[PDB]
């Protein structure tokens, strides 16, 4: 059991964190399982070639370091790579291929863009399930994302358009987060989400959505987050075929009408959250009262109250006569 | 019932109440000892996604799954270490060594503080992981934080925290390797450290105490209940002298037996 004189080693956990390191010290034992290298000044030239031979390392924590390209010379069997808060710009096939067993990649707070990711970079990442790209320089969703991805976070980027090929064939994806990007209804491509058979959660919070998107996948969708947009209307087919949808949330949106029957396909809608919406209460909303009176006991609905006209502003919709 | 009067030195721990089985293996729950009403606060642990605090107005509502409100937090949370104290939530902000204070009446972050040199984000968690590196605790003496540093070779460090300025008021290094502990809690300024079996060290007991009044520590052996073999949270409440425990999806409370106090 050797240990770098600068580090602390305990039963496979290698603590080299917060130690003003510009390179990884010599002397990490070959039974190392977890490398704590966070809160250092390590750059790519600081990662020695010998590191690749630490065959038992499954997790590397390299967040808050000085990497400006995807790290190379990594232990071959590493499964979890935490790279948040580096200056990483570019991802290449050579770097990704060298760690074929990677399951979890956290790249939050880096400078990755679509053009920076080499074409086919992920072709050999046949085990990658979790990819976090929050707070990067993405303008679009990269093409060629591994077909095995289950969770994809692209929040707080500058995404403007989504191409159907980019999400095409991501049949295992169940969680997609697109919060805080520059997406318009115009930006969403036709049927971009349609073929996400396994998708369970779709989050579009804090985008610039004006109308609820359409052609959402129903086979598996259970949660859809549209809160904190400016959605004035619900197209008649916005919730068509969403037979598994469990929670739907359009709080904090400019909803004044709900056309009759938009929830007709919501067979499983357990929690429906419609608070913080400017509900106009007139002829067109009479159905709501009845639909809420006939609403099943298990279903929990909240947030439906009149704001216009002035006379009945603030009065619960499910109670008004006319 | 007096949350500022020391009940003594802990001598025994007993299962008291089994409330229900959560849908999440790990999490924490508690009451606010400086709050007159019987509110319950609930935060299941969901990796990479823990960002809400749920509030129930009664035990019946809690068991029925009927929240009074849910608080959307301004940042994600690491681990199961949160507390609620005089109407504020305190929690470890995800992938930081910082405590955030979030006022519940106004739903606004009212403070943040750095816990100097604390390891964080699955570096010195309790034994089950879950980014449980930093654990808050309330007792008769006030607000505490339980963590580890590399200066103390990964062993538990205790700091007393000012609940309004968020400045460390005192710091003590213990002799106990934090990752070896299942959990820990404070009573009367004494740290009690739990060792227990996990489903996947054959003893379930409090095997170590550190007394911050004296800066003195010792080995002990107080049997500690562990029916489900996955302790994710242990929170002491100085108002009712109970432990609020989350064990392998089970939300339960443990009663305590005390003997004459230490210095
Ligand atoms: C989609 O999810 C189901 C869940 O039952 C899983 O069995 C299936 O493998 C997933 N799709 C693919 C292509 O793996
Ligand atoms: C949910 O939808 C399924 C069809 O996919 C249906 O069989 C079921 O009855 C629905 N849930 C409820 C509670 O009715
Ligand atoms: Na007391
Ligand atoms: Na706690
Ligand atoms: Na605790």
Curated annotation (Swiss-Prot), chain A:
Reported effect, residue 19 to A: Abolishes ADGRL3 binding
Disulphide connectivity of cysteines: 3-9, 7-16, 281-306
Residues carrying sugar: 198, 254, 268
Result, substituting residue 153 to A: No effect on homodimerization
PTM comment: N-glycosylated.
Extracellular side: 1-322
Impact upon substituting residue 69 to G: In HH21; patients have a second mutation in another HH-associated gene including FGFR1, HS6ST1 and FGF17
Domain LRRNT span(s) in chain numbering: 1-30
Tissue: Expressed in kidney, brain, pancreas, skeletal muscle, lung, liver, placenta, and heart.
LRR repeats: 31-52, 56-76, 77-98, 101-122, 127-147, 148-169, 172-192, 198-219, 220-241, 244-265
Disorder: Hypogonadotropic hypogonadism 21 with or without anosmia: A disorder characterized by absent or incomplete sexual maturation by the age of 18 years, in conjunction with low levels of circulating gonadotropins and testosterone and no other abnormalities of the hypothalamic-pituitary axis. In some cases, it is associated with non-reproductive phenotypes, such as anosmia, cleft palate, and sensorineural hearing loss. Anosmia or hyposmia is related to the absence or hypoplasia of the olfactory bulbs and tracts.
Name of the protein: Leucine-rich repeat transmembrane protein FLRT3
Organism: Homo sapiens (Human)
Taxonomic lineage of the native organism: Eukaryota, Metazoa, Chordata, Craniata, Vertebrata
Residues of the full protein shown: 29 to 350 of 649
UniProtKB/Swiss-Prot annotation, chain B:
Domain of life per record: Eukaryota
Disruption phenotype: Mutant mice are viable and present no obvious physical phenotype, except a decreased body weight. Compared to wild-type, mutants are hyperactive, and their dorsal striatum contains higher levels of the neurotransmitters dopamine and serotonin. Cocaine treatment causes a higher increase in locomotor activity than in wild-type. Impaired formation of excitatory synapses, characterized by a significant loss of spines in the S.oriens and S.radiatum, but not in the S.lacunosum-moleculare. Inhibitory synapses are not affected.
Expression sites by tissue: Localizes to postsynaptic spines in non-overlapping dendritic domains of CA1-region pyramidal neurons: specifically localizes to excitatory synapses in the S.oriens and S.radiatum, corresponding to distinct presynaptic inputs onto CA1-region pyramidal neurons.
Assembly and interaction partners: Heterodimer of 2 chains generated by proteolytic processing; the large extracellular N-terminal fragment and the membrane-bound C-terminal fragment predominantly remain associated and non-covalently linked. Interacts (via olfactomedin-like domain) with FLRT1 (via extracellular domain). Interacts (via olfactomedin-like domain) with FLRT2 (via extracellular domain). Interacts (via olfactomedin-like domain) with FLRT3 (via extracellular domain); the interaction is direct. Interacts (via extracellular domain) with TENM1. Interacts (via extracellular domain) with TENM2.
Modifications made to the protein after synthesis: Autoproteolytically processed at the GPS region of the GAIN-B domain; this cleavage modulates receptor activity.
Domain free text: The Stachel sequence (also named stalk) in the C-terminal part of the extracellular domain (ECD) functions as a tethered agonist. In the inactivated receptor, the Stachel sequence (also named stalk) is embedded in the GAIN-B domain, where it adopts a beta-strand conformation. On activation, the Stachel moves into the 7 transmembrane region and adopts a twisted hook-shaped configuration that forms contacts within the receptor, leading to coupling of a G-alpha protein, which activates signaling.
Positions annotated to bind Ca(2+): 135, 183-184, 234
Species whose genome carries this gene: Mus musculus (Mouse)
Upper classification of the organism: Eukaryota, Metazoa, Chordata, Craniata, Vertebrata
Disulfide bond entries: 6-188
Region spans: Interaction with FLRT3: 120-150
Effect on the protein of changing residue 49 to T: Strongly reduces FLRT2 binding
Similarity annotation: Belongs to the G-protein coupled receptor 2 family. LN-TM7 subfamily.
Cell compartment(s), UniProt: Cell membrane; Postsynaptic cell membrane; Cell projection, Axon; Cell junction
Stated name of the protein: Adhesion G protein-coupled receptor L3
């Amino acid at each position: 059991k050797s240990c770098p004189s600068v580090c602390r080693c305990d039963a496979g956990f290698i603590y080299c964190n917060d130690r003003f390191l510009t390179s990884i010290p010599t002397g990490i034992p070959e039974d190392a399982t977890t490398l704590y290298l966070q809160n250092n000044q390590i750059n790519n030239a600081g990662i020695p070639s010998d590191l690749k031979n630490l065959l038992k390392v499954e997790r590397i924590y390299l967040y808050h370091n000085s990497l400006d390209e995807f790290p190379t010379n990594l232990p071959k069997y590493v499964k979890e790579l935490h790279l948040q808060e580096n200056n990483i710009r570019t991802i290449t096939y050579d770097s990704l291929s060298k760690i074929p067993y990677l399951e979890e990649l956290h790249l939050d707070d880096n400078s990755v863009s679509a053009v920076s990711i080499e074409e086919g970079a992920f072709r050999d990442s046949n085990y990658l399930r979790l990819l976090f790209l929050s707070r990067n320089h993405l303008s679009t969703i990269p093409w060629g994302l591994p077909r095995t991805i289950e969770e994809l976070r692209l929040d707080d980027n500058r995404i403007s358009t989504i191409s159907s090929p980019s999400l095409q064939g991501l049949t295992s994806l169940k969680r997609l987060v697109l919060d805080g990007n520059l997406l318009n209804n115009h930006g969403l491509g036709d049927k971009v989400f349609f073929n996400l058979v396994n998708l369970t959660e779709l989050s579009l919070v804090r985008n610039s959505l004006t109308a609820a998107p359409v052609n959402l996948p129903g086979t598996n969708l259970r949660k859809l987050y549209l809160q904190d947009n400016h959605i004035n209307r619900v197209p008649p087919n916005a919730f068509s075929y969403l037979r598994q949808l469990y929670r739907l949330d359009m709080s904090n949106n400019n909803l004044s009408n709900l056309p009759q029957g938009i929830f007709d396909d919501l067979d499983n809608i357990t929690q429906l959250i419609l608070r913080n919406n400017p509900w106009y209460c007139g002829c067109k909303m009479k159905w709501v009262r009845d639909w809420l009176q006939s609403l099943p006991v298990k279903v929990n609905v909240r947030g439906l109250m009149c704001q216009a006209p002035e006379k009945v502003r603030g009065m619960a919709i499910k109670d008004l006569n006319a | 019932g007096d949350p500022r009067e020391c009940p003594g030195l802990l001598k025994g721990v007993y299962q008291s109440e089994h409330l229900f089985e959560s849908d999440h293996q790990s999490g924490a729950w508690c009451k606010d000892p400086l709050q007159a009403s019987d509110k319950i606060y609930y935060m299941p642990w969901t990796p990479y996604r823990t960002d809400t605090l749920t509030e129930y107005s009664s035990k019946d509502d809690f068991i029925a799954g009927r929240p009074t409100t849910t608080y959307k937090l301004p940042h994600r949370v690491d681990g199961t270490g949160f507390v609620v104290y005089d109407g504020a939530l305190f929690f470890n902000k995800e992938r930081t060594r910082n405590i955030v204070k979030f006022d519940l009446r106004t739903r606004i972050k009212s403070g943040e503080a750095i816990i100097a040199n604390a390891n964080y984000h699955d570096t010195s968690p309790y034994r089950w992981g879950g980014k449980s590196d930093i654990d808050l605790a309330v007792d008769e003496n006030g607000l505490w934080v339980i963590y580890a540093t590399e200066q103390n070779n990964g062993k538990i460090v205790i700091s007393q925290l000012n609940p309004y300025t968020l400045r460390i008021e005192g710091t003590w290094d213990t002799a106990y390797d934090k990752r070896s502990a299942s959990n820990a809690f404070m009573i009367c300024g004494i740290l009690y450290v739990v060792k227990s079996v996990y489903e996947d060290a054959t003893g379930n007991k409090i095997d170590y105490i550190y007394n911050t009044d004296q800066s003195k520590d010792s080995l002990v052996d107080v049997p500690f209940p562990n029916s489900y073999q996955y302790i994710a949270a242990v929170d002491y409440n100085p108002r009712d002298n109970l432990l609020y425990v989350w064990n392998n999806y089970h939300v339960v409370k443990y009663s305590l037996d005390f003997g004459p106090a230490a210095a």
